[PDB]
Structure 1
Amino acid sequence: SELLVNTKSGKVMGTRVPVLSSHISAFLGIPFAEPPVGNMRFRRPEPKKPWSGVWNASTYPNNCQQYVDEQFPGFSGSEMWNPNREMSEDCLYLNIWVPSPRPKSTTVMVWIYGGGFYSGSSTLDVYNGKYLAYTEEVVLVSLSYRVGAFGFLALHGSQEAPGNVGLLDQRMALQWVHDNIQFFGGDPKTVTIFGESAGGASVGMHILSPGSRDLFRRAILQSGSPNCPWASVSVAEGRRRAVELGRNLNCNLNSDEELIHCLREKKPQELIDVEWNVLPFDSIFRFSFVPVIDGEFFPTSLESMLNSGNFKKTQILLGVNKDEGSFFLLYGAPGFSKDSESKISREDFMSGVKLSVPHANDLGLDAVTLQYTDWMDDNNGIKNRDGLDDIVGDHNVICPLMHFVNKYTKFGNGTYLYFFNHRASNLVWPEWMGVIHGYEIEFVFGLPLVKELNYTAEEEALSRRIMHYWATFAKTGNPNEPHSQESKWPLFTTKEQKFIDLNTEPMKVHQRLRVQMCVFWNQFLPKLLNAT
Structure 2
Amino acid sequence: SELLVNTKSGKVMGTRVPVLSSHISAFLGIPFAEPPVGNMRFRRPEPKKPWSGVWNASTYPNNCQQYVDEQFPGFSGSEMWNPNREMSEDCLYLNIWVPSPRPKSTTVMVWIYGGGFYSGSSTLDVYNGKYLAYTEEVVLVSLSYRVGAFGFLALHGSQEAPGNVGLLDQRMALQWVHDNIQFFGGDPKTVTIFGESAGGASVGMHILSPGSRDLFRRAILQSGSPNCPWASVSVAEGRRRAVELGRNLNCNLNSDEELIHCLREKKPQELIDVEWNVLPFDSIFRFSFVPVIDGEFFPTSLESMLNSGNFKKTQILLGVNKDEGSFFLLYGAPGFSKDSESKISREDFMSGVKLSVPHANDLGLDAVTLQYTDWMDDNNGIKNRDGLDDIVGDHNVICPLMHFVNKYTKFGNGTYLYFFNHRASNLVWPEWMGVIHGYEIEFVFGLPLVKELNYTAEEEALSRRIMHYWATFAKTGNPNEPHSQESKWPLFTTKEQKFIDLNTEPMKVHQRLRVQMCVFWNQFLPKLLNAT
TM over 0.5: yes
Task: After TM superposition, list the pairs within 5 Å mapping 1:377-396 onto structure 2.
Answer: 377-396=377-396
Three-state SS of the structure 2 residue aligned to 1:370 is helix
Query: 2:99 — aligned with what?
Result: 99
* 1:412 alignment counterpart: 412
Q: Is the partner of 1:320 in helix, strand or coil?
A: strand
SS of structure 1 residue aligned to 2:110: strand
Q: Distance in 1 between matches of 2:272 and 2:380?
A: 39
CA distance in 2, matches of 1:291, 1:113: 15
Render the CA deviation track for 1:195-252: whole Å, top value 9, x for unaligned. Answer: 0000000000000000000000000000000000000000000000000000000001
Q: Post-superposition shift, 1:81?
A: 0.3
Q: Please give the alpha-carbon distance, in whole angstroms, between the structure 2 residues aligned to 1:139 and 1:156.
A: 38
Partner of 2:530: 530
- Cα offset for 1:104? 1.2
Please give the secondary structure, in 1, of the residue aligned with 2:66: coil
> What do residues 462-487 of structure 1 show as CA deviations (whole Å, max 9, x unaligned)?
00000000000000000000110000
In 1, Cα distance between the equivalents of 2:209 and 2:105? 26
Q: 2:27 is matched with which residue?
A: 27
Shift of 1:150: 0.2
After superposition, the C-alpha distances for 1:181-202 in whole angstroms (9 at most, x for unaligned) are: 0000000000000000000000
| Distance in structure 2 (CA, Å) of the matches to 1:155 and 1:353 | 32
Q: Distance in 2 between matches of 1:62 and 1:144?
A: 10
- Report percent identity of matched pairs: 100
Structure 1 segment 114-129 matched on structure 2, within 5 A: 114-129=114-129
Pairwise CA distance, 1:276:
0.4
Q: In 1, distance between residues paired with 2:105 and 2:176?
A: 16
- In structure 2, distance between residues paired with 1:190 and 1:142: 16
Q: Deviations over 1:20-61 (max 9, x none)?
A: 000000000000000000000000000000111000000000
Tell me what 2:261 maps to: 261
SS in 1 for 2:339: coil
Counterpart check, 1:469 vs 2:462: no
Q: Equivalents in 2 of 1:340, 1:450: separation in Å? A: 31
Q: CA separation in 2, counterparts of 1:362 and 1:2?
A: 64
Distance 2:249 2:378 in 1: 45
Query: How far apart, in 1, do the equivalents of 2:507 and 2:41 lie?
Result: 48
| Matches of 1:187 and 1:140, distance apart in 2 | 12
Provide Cα deviations, 1:433-473, integer angstroms capped at 9, x if missing partner: 00000000000000000010000000000000000000000
Q: CA deviation at 1:269?
A: 0.4
Per the alignment, in what secondary structure is the counterpart of residue 115 of structure 2?
A: coil
Instruction: Tell me the secondary structure at the aligned position of residue 437 of structure 1.
Output: coil
Matched residue SS, 1:410:
helix
Shift of 1:268: 0.3
Deviations 1:406-448 (A, max 9, x none): 0000000000000000000000000000000000000000000
What is the distance in 2 between the residues matched to 1:19 and 1:210? 39
Structure 1 position 176, deviation (Å): 0.3
Rounded to whole Å, the distance in 1 between the matches of 2:256 and 2:316 is 40
Q: C-alpha separation between the residues in 1 aligned to 2:118 and 2:79?
A: 16
Query: Displacement of 1:307 after TM fit?
Result: 0.2
Structure 1 CA distance for aligned equivalents of residues 474 and 364 of structure 2? 41
- 2:289 maps to which residue? 289
Give, in angstroms, the shift of residue 527 of structure 1.
0.5
**C-alpha separation in 2, matches of 1:83 and 1:508:** 38
SS of the residue aligned with 2:95? strand
Structure-to-structure mapping, 1:355-434, within 5 angstroms? 355-434=355-434
CA distance in 1, matches of 2:336, 2:523: 30
CA distance in 2, matches of 1:183, 1:177: 10
DSSP 3-state at the match of 2:351:
helix
1:331 CA displacement? 0.3
Q: Shift of the alpha carbon at 1:336? A: 0.3
Structure 2 CA distance for aligned equivalents of residues 397 and 133 of structure 1: 29
Q: Which residue number in structure 1 is paired with residue 280 of structure 2?
A: 280
Q: Secondary structure at the match of 2:411?
A: coil
2: CA distance, partners of 1:85 / 1:429: 24
| Shift of residue 69, structure 1, vs aligned partner | 0.3
Alpha-carbon deviations, 1:101-136, whole Å to 9, x = none?
011110000000000000000000000000000000
SS of residue matched to 1:258: helix
Alpha-carbon distance in 2 for matches of 1:26, 1:248: 43
1:96, distance to aligned residue in structure 2 (A): 0.2
Give the superposition deviation at 1:390: 0.1
Deviations 1:293-337 (A, max 9, x none): 000000000000000000000000000000000000000000001
- The alpha carbon displacement at 1:273 in A equals 0.4
CA distance in 2, matches of 1:269, 1:331: 22
Q: Identify the residue that residue 179 of structure 1 maps to in structure 2.
A: 179
C-alpha distance in structure 2 between counterparts of 1:6 and 1:36, whole Å: 25
CA shift at 1:287, angstroms?
Answer: 0.1
> Which position in structure 1 is the counterpart of 2:168?
168
- Consecutive unaligned residues in structure 2, runs of 5 or more: none
Return the alpha-carbon distance in structure 2 between the equivalents of residues 458 and 80 of structure 1. Answer: 24
Q: Distance in 2 between matches of 1:416 and 1:104?
A: 29
Q: What CA RMSD, in Å, does the superposition of the two structures yield over aligned residues? A: 0.3
Output one character per residue of 1:259-293: Cα deviation in whole Å (capped at 9) or x when no partner: 00000000000000000000000110000000000
May I ask how many residue pairs the two structures share in their alignment? 532
Q: Distance in 2 between matches of 1:103 and 1:267?
A: 44
Following the alignment from structure 2 to structure 1, what is the Cα–Cα distance between the partners of residues 367 and 184?
A: 54
Instruction: Compute the displacement of 1:91 (Å).
Output: 0.3
Instruction: Structure 1: give runs of 5+ residues left out of the alignment.
Output: none
TM-superposition CA deviations, 1:76-112 (whole Å, max 9, x none): 0000000000000000000000000011110000000
Using the alignment, how far apart are the partners of 1:252 and 1:415 within structure 2? 50
* Secondary structure, aligned partner of 1:91: coil
**1-structure distance, mates of 2:459, 2:363:** 45
CA distance in 2, matches of 1:5, 1:97: 13
Shift of 1:19: 0.3
1:365 and 1:35 mapped to 2: Cα distance? 46
Residue 530 of structure 1: how far off its partner (Å): 0.5
Alpha-carbon distance in 1 for matches of 2:475, 2:91:
30
